[PDB]
Amino acid sequence: ALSPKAATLAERSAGLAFSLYQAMAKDQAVENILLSPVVVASSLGLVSLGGKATTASQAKAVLSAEQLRDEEVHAGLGELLRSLSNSTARNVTWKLGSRLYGPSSVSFAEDFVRSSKQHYNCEHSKINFRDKRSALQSINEWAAQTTDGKLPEVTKDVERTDGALLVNAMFFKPHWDEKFHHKMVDNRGFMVTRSYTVGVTMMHRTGLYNYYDDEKEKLQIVEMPLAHKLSSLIILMPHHVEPLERLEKLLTKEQLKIWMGKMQKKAVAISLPKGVVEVTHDLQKHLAGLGLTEAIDKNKADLSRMSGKKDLYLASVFHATAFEWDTEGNPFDQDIYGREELRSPKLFYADHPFIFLVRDTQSGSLLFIGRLVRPKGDKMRDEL
Amino acid sequence: GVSDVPRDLEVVAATPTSLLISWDAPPYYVRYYRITYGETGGNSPVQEFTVPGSKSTATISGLKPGVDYTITVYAEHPYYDPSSSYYFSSKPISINYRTPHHHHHH
């Protein structure tokens, strides 16, 4: 199980991920959201490790680890990263890579390279950000090799070319405890808004799931266990198509606990969009909004432990994830469909935007928080 | 929140002895649509047939002219394997329609 330092940091990581989620959901430009709390926290841990003066202390202040010692933060976050890339079942796919990109004229210090490699598995690369064809090719091919071609592009441009670029590339594919049949797929319209529909493939299956329908709050919540019940994917969706804002404001650590406590084991006929969703965020402006103001400023940053460059700052924090919704999962006994408790299933038809979370059931840690607003596909049109 | 029921069931074209009907898919995979029809009010059991779930239209043949019929459409949803006998039915959608006495042309 997690040590006391790693358990409190897991709780703080989830709090931080809810805070970034809410700030990004308010930004009307953002459509899909996908955050991994341990990756967001390890990005602040890297700033603490490579920083001095208020640059490193502001990073510790966001993780509320000002009581903990410097090495206790790196050991605690180091323990969390290893525990999630090991405790998640063998059939559940989770690929993660972290790379710090600096300009060509930058030498990273041996101690920083050694500890960032030990605790965060951080890789280091030197790059001419101004030659954008070469710089983008290097970043995107590294992210594609990290994720086995699932995330082929982190970004289409490098906005700030005079500092460090932290890039986190991920691929997560939930493997269900009870698989969907690969032939129960059809083409449906996913309603992004009440007036914008996109053509998607949907996968369907019925089973016994922890479920709650709140008629007062017009929402449904279902918990879908992943392989061997060591983690679960929780989906929260309004009854009808609507902007997720009303439900996102209700969603808190305390309210998710009440909703999970109200879930009951019921027959649920689930339909989900099937495919890969590529979500990339540059968290630089959002991390500044939560306390990390000095690291992101060209003049005030102090990343001297990272490199003696001076004037080197955190220009970007890319959080790039390919999340695959697929039918693959473990086999199960189909005699369940002849039992009384499955005579009349309730429906969880996810044909419109929904919020989702991936939780580790062994430690209670939050692995992912996000929303699916725009799946991949073309706008549907029948009568013109 | 969102009923398991097909929608917009309507008669597209009618003849004295036939009806061409159309509907919109309910939520969740449909393997077959079960269409039932019978005389409105009459204590005679309803006749039924299926059409594949990839279709949204059906023809009801062998009807009597100038008779009121109740037409009902259900969707047969598989629990897991689409080629298995384990399925549950959706809620029904129904309409009442009188067949014409004569054909449009003499």
Could you tell me the resolution of this structure in angstroms?
A: 1.9
Region A4-174+277-324: CATH code: 3.30.497.10
Phi-psi bin for B8: left (phi > 0), alpha (psi -120 to 50), beta?
left
Residue B103 within any structural domain of the chain:
no
d(CA A96, CA A81) in angstroms, rounded, equals 10
Contact A220 B84 (CB under 8 A): no
Contacts within 8 Å (CB) and 24+ apart, A140-147: A142/A97, A142/A99, A142/A167, A142/A169, A143/A97, A143/A167, A143/A169, A143/A320, A146/A95, A146/A96, A146/A97, A146/A170, A146/A171, A147/A95, A147/A97, A147/A171, A147/A322
Of B77, B81, B83, the CB nearest to A269: B77
**Lookup result for tokens 């159309």:** B22
Query: Distance (Å, rounded) from C-alpha A27 to C-alpha A232?
Result: 28
C-alpha distances in Å from residue A252, one per residue of A161, A239, A258, A322: 37, 19, 10, 25
Cβ count near A332 (within 10 Å)? 13
Consecutive H or E run containing B74 = strand B68-78
Q: Which residue has the tokens 């949204």?
A: B56
- In one letter, which amino acid is A162? D
Matching residue, tokens 């690369």: A125
Are the beta carbons of A205 and B80 separated by less than 8 Å?
A: yes
Question: Is residue B105, in this structure, part of any structural domain at all?
Answer: no
Q: Which residues pair with A329 in a beta bridge?
A: A176
Which amino acid is located at B93 in the chain?
A: I
**Is B27 in CB contact (< 8 Å) with chain A?**
yes
Q: For residue B32, which of B48, B6, B51, B58 has the smallest C-alpha distance?
A: B51
Structural domain tally of chain B? 1
| Position A245, amino acid | E
Using an 8 Å Cβ cutoff, are A85 and A9 in contact?
Answer: no
DSSP bridge partners of A100: A124, A166
Single out the residue of A308, A320, A369, A326 nearest to residue A140, CA to CA: A320
β-strand partners of A34: A370
Q: Is there a contact between A62 and A315 (Cβ–Cβ < 8 Å)? A: no
Assign A213 to helix, strand or coil: strand
Task: Give residue A85's Cα distance to chain centre.
Answer: 14
Strand duo A264-282 + A231-238: pairing: unpaired
Cα of A190 vs its chain's centroid, Å: 22
Query: At residue B42, what are phi and psi to the nearest 5 degrees?
Result: -55, 135
Domain(s) labelled CATH 2.30.39.10 in chain A stretch across 185-273+335-372
Question: Which tokens in the block code for residue A280?
Answer: 């990339």
Q: Check B1 against A220: CB less than 8 A apart.
A: yes
Query: Is the separation of the CB atoms in B44 and B92 below 8 Å?
Result: no
Q: How far apart are CA A330 and CA A332, in angstroms?
A: 7
Q: Is some CB atom of chain A closer than 8 A to the CB atom of B86?
A: yes
Measure CB to CB from residue A183 to each of B2, B77, B82 and give the nearest one.
B82
How far the first Cα of chain A sits from its last, in Å, is 59
Give φ, ψ of B66 to 5 degrees: 60, 30
Check B2 against A347: CB less than 8 A apart. Answer: yes
Sign of torsion over alpha carbons A216, A220, A221, A222: positive
Q: Give CA–CA dist A224/A147, Å, rounded.
A: 24
CATH topology of domain A185-273+335-372: Alpha-1-antitrypsin; domain 1 (2.30.39)
Q: Which residue of A has its CA nearest to B26?
A: A349
Flag whether residue B29 sits within 8 Å of chain A, measured between CB atoms: yes
Q: Classify residue A228 by its DSSP letter.
A: G
Q: Is residue B106 part of a domain?
A: no
Minimal CA separation from A374 to chain B, in Å: 19
The technique by which this structure was obtained is: X-ray
Q: Which domain holds residue B38?
A: 7-98
Which residues in chain A touch residue B81, judged by CB atoms under 8 angstroms apart?
181, 183-184, 334
Where exactly does CATH 3.30.497.10 map onto chain A?
4-174+277-324
Strands B32-39 and B68-78: antiparallel
Residue with tokens 């999970």: A260
CB atoms within 10 A of CB A377: 17
Q: What are residue A108's phi and psi, to 5 degrees? A: -80, 140
B65: contact with A, CB 8 A cutoff: no
CA diameter of chain B: 51
Query: Among the residues of chain A, which ranges form H helices?
Result: 4-26, 37-50, 53-62, 70-87, 110-120, 132-146, 245-250, 253-262, 284-288
DSSP string over A288-345: HTTT--STT-TTT---TTT-TTSS--EEEEEEEEEEEE-S-B----GGGGGSGGGSS-
d(CA A322, nearest CA chain B) in Å: 26
**What is the Cα–Cα distance from A227 to A326, expressed in whole angstroms?**
14
Cα separation of A99 and A39, whole Å? 12
Q: What distances in angstroms separate CA B31 from CA A184, B47, B56, B78, B80, one per listed residue?
A: 9, 20, 12, 7, 11
Q: By the 8 A CB rule, do A358 and A172 touch? A: yes
Tell me whether strands A93-103 and A164-173 are parallel, antiparallel or unpaired.
Answer: antiparallel
Residues of B in contact with A186 (CB under 8 A): 29, 53
**Domain harbouring B88, CATH code:** 2.60.40.10
Chain A residue numbers touching B78 (CB-CB < 8 A): 184, 204
| Alpha carbons A127 and A137: distance in angstroms, whole number | 11
A355: Cα within 13 Å, side-chain hemisphere: 24
Best of A235, A337, A349 to disrupt the B interface (most B CBs within 10 Å) is A337
Burial-class residue A86 by CB neighbours within 10 Å (0-12, 13-18, 19+). Answer: exposed
Q: Which of B3, B5, B24, B28 to mutate to test the interface with A (most CBs of A within 10 A)?
A: B28
Min Cα distance B94 → chain A (Å) is 20
Phi, psi at residue B73, to the nearest 5°? -125, 130
Q: Measuring CA to CA, which residue among A299, A298, A319 is closest to residue A163?
A: A298
Measured in Å, how far apart are chain B's first and last C-alpha atoms? 50
Nearest alpha carbon to residue B94 among B9, B5, B3, B17: B9
The answer to whether the beta carbons of residues A39 and A90 sit under 8 Å apart is no
| C-alpha distance from residue A98 to each of A101, A119, A301 (Å) | 10, 11, 21
- Using a CB-CB cut-off of 8 Å, the residues of chain A touching B77 are 206, 269
Strands A314-325 and A264-282 turn out to be: antiparallel
